[PDB]
Amino acid sequence: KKKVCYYYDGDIGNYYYGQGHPMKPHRIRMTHNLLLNYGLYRKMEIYRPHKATAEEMTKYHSDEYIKFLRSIRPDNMSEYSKQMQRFNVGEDCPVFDGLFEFCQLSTGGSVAGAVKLNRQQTDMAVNWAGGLHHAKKSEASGFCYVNDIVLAILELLKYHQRVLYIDIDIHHGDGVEEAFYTTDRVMTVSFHKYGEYFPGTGDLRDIGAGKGKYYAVNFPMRDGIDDESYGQIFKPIISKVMEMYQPSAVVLQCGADSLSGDRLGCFNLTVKGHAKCVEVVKTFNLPLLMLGGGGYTIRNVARCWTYETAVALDCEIPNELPYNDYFEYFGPDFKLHISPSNMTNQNTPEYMEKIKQRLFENLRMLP
Numbered sequence: 001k002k003k004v005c006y007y008y009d010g011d012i013g014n015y016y017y018g019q020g021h022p023m024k025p026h027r028i029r030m031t032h033n034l035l036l037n038y039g040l041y042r043k044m045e046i047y048r049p050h051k052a053t054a055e056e057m058t059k060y061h062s063d064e065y066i067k068f069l070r071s072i073r074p075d076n077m078s079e080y081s082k083q084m085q086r087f088n089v090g091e092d093c094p095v096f097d098g099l100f101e102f103c104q105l106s107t108g109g110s111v112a113g114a115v116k117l118n119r120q121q122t123d124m125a126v127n128w129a130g131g132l133h134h135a136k137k138s139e140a141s142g143f144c145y146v147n148d149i150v151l152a153i154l155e156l157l158k159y160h161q162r163v164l165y166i167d168i169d170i171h172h173g174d175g176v177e178e179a180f181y182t183t184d185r186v187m188t189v190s191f192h193k194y195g196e197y198f199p200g201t202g203d204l205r206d207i208g209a210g211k212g213k214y215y216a217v218n219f220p221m222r223d224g225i226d227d228e229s230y231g232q233i234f235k236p237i238i239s240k241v242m243e244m245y246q247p248s249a250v251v252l253q254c255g256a257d258s259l260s261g262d263r264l265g266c267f268n269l270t271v272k273g274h275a276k277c278v279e280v281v282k283t284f285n286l287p288l289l290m291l292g293g294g295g296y297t298i299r300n301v302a303r304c305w306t307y308e309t310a311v312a313l314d315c316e317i318p319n320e321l322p323y324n325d326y327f328e329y330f331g332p333d334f335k336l337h338i339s340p341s342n343m344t345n346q347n348t349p350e351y352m353e354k355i356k357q358r359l360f361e362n363l364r365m366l367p
């Protein structure tokens with residue numbers, strides 16, 4: 001079997017974005033506890049991430065920005081109000097106790113995973129605490145402070161001429177796209193809701209610039225996309241990307257805010273529909289870093305990432321959930337898998353095929 005390494009620090013669920021903030025790191029602990037109770041620890045290597053250093057983070061981020069994140073605390077915010085404005089910290093990216101440590105552990109898992117892949121010590125590495133795709137070189141954005149994904153891709157680029165990034169979070173992976181927009185050494189592929197929706201980027205027509213022209217791919221979608229519709233475009237697009245780009249490593253952001261029932265997202269994917277993306281990417285037999293992402297209905301985040309860990313291990317697991325420390329969260333049914341809702345799919349067959357056809361025309365422009 002393909003080998004899987006998995007990163008988790010038992011404090012990650014203790015970082016708290018603040019009362020009423022929808023981002024709940026506790027969801028990572030729920031995920032871990034569920035997959036432990038399913039027995040999946042028997043089949044993979046489990047590591048604690050290191051705390052990523054300033055030196056590691058400044059491989060992408062500016063020194064001033066990282067020094068600020070290392071400095072800012074609830075008790076000294078009054079003294080830092082102008083830096084808070086410059087670095088976009090204090091509102092949707094709040095100041096909280098242990099903010100910097102949270103960044104260090106999230107990032108540590110992603111970079112450590114990348115090193116493992118580079119050293120050919122694993123076939124897949126998993127960091128559900130990562131996937132912070134909105135963070136920018138010198139500013140926080142969209143709940144994200146340090147871009148673990150960009151840092152992990154930079155690590156892979158030490159050994160790999162061509163790295164493929166795939167993002168199935170409901171939001172456009174703008175910070176990752178931006179970092180690599182002018183290079184052909186990373187192709188970014190984002191599927192996301194588009195139409196006056198955060199972050200506002202990821203138009204069909206954003207295809208990269210300079211040497212990077214045609215190395216950014218964006219599939220904009222409407223509310224209510226379902227497993228059938230998503231599956232019919234994901235496999236063909238990734239197949240064509242693989243054929244034309246021929247990457248030697250892949251990073252897959254597995255943001256679960258694209259699931260049905262998400263508190264913030266308006267897609268209608270099941271856990272099986274979402275996990276099909278992991279199965280498709282695995283068929284290409286390339287070194288693969290799987291990262292977390294959004295997701296705000298936390299029972300469904302735990303289900304999603306537990307099932308995707310099982311997919312990585314080629315292990316079926318039963319729909320009947322095992323007893324676990326969060327069992328009451330999974331009522332009323334106590335099953336792993338979720339049903340779609342009755343929401344309308346605004347993505348017509350013709351819309352999906354037309355967008356796919358435009359993306360195929362762009363991919364045919366590769367050498």
Ligand SMILES: O=C([C@H]1C[C@@H](c2cccc(Cl)c2)CN1)N1CCN(c2nccc3ccsc23)CC1
Nearest residue numbers: 023092130131132142143144171198257293294
């Ligand atoms: O889901 C996300 C992003 C977060 C990202 C992620 C992944 C992993 C760990 C972490 Cl800590 C964060 C996964 N995608 N967001 C929710 C919606 N939000 C806004 N919507 C409307 C409006 C506004 C205005 C400001 S923020 C916002 C933007 C951020």
Ligand SMILES: O=S(=O)([O-])CC[NH2+]C1CCCCC1
Nearest residue numbers: 009010011012048051101105
């Ligand atoms: O379960 S456990 O291994 O004790 C969790 C370790 N947490 C670390 C977070 C960063 C600061 C050092 C401790």
Ligand SMILES: [Ca+2]
Nearest residue numbers: 167169171191
């Ligand atoms: Ca996306």
Ligand code: NA
Nearest residue numbers: 180183186215
């Ligand atoms: Na690119």
Ligand SMILES: [Zn+2]
Nearest residue numbers: 169171257294
């Ligand atoms: Zn998101």
